[PDB]
Design a protein around this ligand. Structure first.
Ligand SMILES: O=C(O)CNC(=O)C(=O)O
Ligand SMILES: [Mg+2]
Ligand code: NI
Ligand SMILES: [Zn+2]
Length: 331
């Protein structure tokens, strides 16, 4: 078995190997990359996402989210308070202000320590989940707006044609902005490209061990667990590496830098934080190997998780018994 310790793997494809996205994902899985739940892909030196980022300041963040925490430093939830719209140039200036800027630090490890010590005492503002793309239309390789759609994959594998579309999302971050522990909708893959700015630190649980994280979460968030049988779908819970180690939960960590891709694999729980002002682009995707994960994915029916238009068909086709109850949740 390849990668039996489930380590995060880092790949350096050549420009020739960067041509065929599907083939490269399958290659990474032949080497055991998926067992970690997360992989890093460093693009060939010849590649670029676009020519410059000098002209992005007028993108609008219609609904910036202030991420307010409750709990203790290693075990907390966050809720998202909606703020007034602002441009990316306005948000960048805010991120760099004395109130929000990254503190002085020695290295990524010192910064990580400071994040876990102090995150709960601040409420950073995240420009998350903005439909759009920063890839140039002429970028032919690993262009996250030009990937094979999940609807087309389902149709190719299973023969059924379904409604829905699959487009990317932009994330503008600042110091301490946080992504809570989650897997993707319908336990899909994700791919995330850090276009510019400061790094993003990731934590990940191997898919084969995801239920250990879920059992810890039920213990640590007992009211939330009574409310919903899949409450990590709400994407609000944080658990620190120290707490994971104390409870024996297998995980790994890695820091993504500008210019790098990360891939999350089906049922790979992940969480993390931004180091400072940055911009990432991410999208879900599927492969043939996903279908069995999609059929088994948990679902939130309590009503809280509320998701995209395209999830309907995935539930309806892959999970027809659950369909009815899940759709009650969504309506
Ligand atoms: O970058 C973020 O805030 C969150 N990203 C992801 O969970 C992802 O790409 O799958
Ligand atoms: Mg602009
Ligand atoms: Ni994700
Ligand atoms: Zn729920």
């Amino acid at each position: 078995a390849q990668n039996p310790n489930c380590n995060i793997m880092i790949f350096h494809p050549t420009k020739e190997e960067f041509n065929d996205f599907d083939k490269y994902i399958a290659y990474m899985e032949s080497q055991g990359a998926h067992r970690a739940g997360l992989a890093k892909i460093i693009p060939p030196k010849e590649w670029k996402a676009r020519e410059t980022y000098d002209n992005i300041s007028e993108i609008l963040i219609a609904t910036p989210l202030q991420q307010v925490a409750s709990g203790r430093a290693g075990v907390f939830t966050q809720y998202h308070k909606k703020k007034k719209a602002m441009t990316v140039g306005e948000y960048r200036h805010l991120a760099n202000s004395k109130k929000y800027q990254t503190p002085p630090h020695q290295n990524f490890e010192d910064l990580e320590r400071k994040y876990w010590k102090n995150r709960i005492y601040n409420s950073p503002i995240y420009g998350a989940d903005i439909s759009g793309s920063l890839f140039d239309e002429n970028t032919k390789q690993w262009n996250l707006g030009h990937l094979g759609t999940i609807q087309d994959l389902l149709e190719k594998e299973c023969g059924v044609v379904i409604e829905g579309v699959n487009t990317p999302y932009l994330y503008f971050g600042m110091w301490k902005t946080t992504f809570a522990w989650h897997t993707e909708d319908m336990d899909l893959y994700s791919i995330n490209y850090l276009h510019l700015g400061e790094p993003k630190t990731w934590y990940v649980v191997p898919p084969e061990h995801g239920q250990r994280l879920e059992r810890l979460a039920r213990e640590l968030f007992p009211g939330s667990s009574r409310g919903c049988g899949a409450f990590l779908r709400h994407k609000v819970a944080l658990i620190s590496p120290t707490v994971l180690k104390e409870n024996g939960i297998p995980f790994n960590r890695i820091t993504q830098e500008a210019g790098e891709f990360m891939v999350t694999f089906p049922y790979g729980y992940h969480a993390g934080f931004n180091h400072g002002f940055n911009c990432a682009e991410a999208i879900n995707f599927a492969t043939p190997r996903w279908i069995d994960y999609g059929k088994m994915a948990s679902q939130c029916s309590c009503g809280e998780a509320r998701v995209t238009f395209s999830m309907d068909a995935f539930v309806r086709i892959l999970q027809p018994e659950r369909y009815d109850l899940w759709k009650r949740g969504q309506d």
